[PDB]
Amino acid sequence: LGIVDSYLKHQEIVLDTLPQTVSNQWRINNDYIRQTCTIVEEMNIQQRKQINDLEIYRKRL
């Protein structure tokens, strides 16, 4: 009984619960992640370039 009593209240919370979120929140979440993916790719490349530039500095010095 008492689990179901609290869970019926839980259900009444789940009912209430997103129009604000519907686009913008997930739009921002996605676009933020796309930003993080873009900078993550750039950081991969930037690291690679730094590896090569330090290897050439050793090979020259």
Binding site: T36, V40, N44
Partner: peptide
């Protein structure tokens, strides 16, 4: 929006 967020987070885990 949810499969983009998933495909993006998988790309994060690959790149990091």
């Amino acid at each position: 929006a949810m499969p983009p967020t998933e495909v993006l987070l998988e790309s994060i885990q690959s790149k990091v």
